[PDB]
């Protein structure tokens, strides 16, 4: 019913998310879980 021009602005559907408090056991964070488990295994073996 009307004549449009070429798009002066291109868009689409996108996701707005929001934009952490430390966990209780976050002192284990620097090392991976596998490292801790293998440390326990190595301690037992040693």
């Amino acid at each position: 019913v009307i004549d449009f021009s070429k798009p002066f602005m291109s868009l689409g559907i996108s996701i707005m998310i929001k934009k952490s408090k430390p966990g209780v056991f976050s002192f284990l964070d620097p090392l991976a879980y596998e490292i801790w488990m293998c440390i326990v295994f190595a301690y037992i073996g040693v």
């Binding site: 964070d29 620097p30 090392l31 879980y33 596998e34 190595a42 073996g45 040693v46």
Partner: protein, 40 residues
């Protein structure tokens, strides 16, 4: 973020190799002393 096991796998290998070496040394000494007793 966390440090992965691949970053420190070599020290685990070294530890297990050292445990095996200690076992081998102790067993060799035990066998030598057992032979020594059997001779005497």
């Amino acid at each position: 973020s966390a440090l992965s096991l691949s970053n420190v796998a070599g020290v685990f290998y070294i530890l297990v190799g050292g445990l095996g070496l200690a076992m081998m040394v102790a067993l060799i000494e035990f066998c030598y002393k057992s032979r020594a007793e059997s001779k005497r």
